[PDB]
């Protein structure tokens, strides 16, 4: 995936245009996008040399 260059973190299978329609209020929808966008932009890895050490 690094060779692909795609977001390292997991990305949920979501269609936000549908979520926009479904939700009555914007605020929870926006918050959800903020979290997932941040999650997909962060690498969840620990240095395994120090861990083994």
């Amino acid at each position: 995936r690094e060779e692909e260059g795609l977001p390292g973190g997991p990305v949920p299978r979501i269609n936000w245009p549908q979520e926009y329609s479904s939700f009555i209020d914007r605020e929870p929808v926006v918050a959800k996008r903020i979290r997932y966008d941040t999650l997909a932009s962060t690498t969840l890895e620990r240095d395994e040399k120090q861990i083994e050490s």
Binding site: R35, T38, L39, T42, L44, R46
Partner: protein, 57 residues
């Protein structure tokens, strides 16, 4: 020269048998008290969860 030697000779077989049994008993104990110890290590999912919380997500 005669008596004590004869009785020692008579003793020999039983003592040999008993000592062989004793050695077998001790090796049997050696293997009996061996167990494979499976260690448990902190699941990395909790580490990932704590990392997420630190990000303020």
């Amino acid at each position: 020269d005669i008596m004590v030697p004869s009785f020692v000779y008579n003793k020999l077989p039983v003592i040999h048998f008993l000592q062989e049994k004793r050695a077998e008993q001790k090796l049997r104990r050696v293997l009996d008290e061996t167990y494979t110890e499976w260690t448990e290590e902190l699941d990395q999912a909790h580490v990932t969860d704590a990392i997420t919380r630190s990000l303020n997500i």
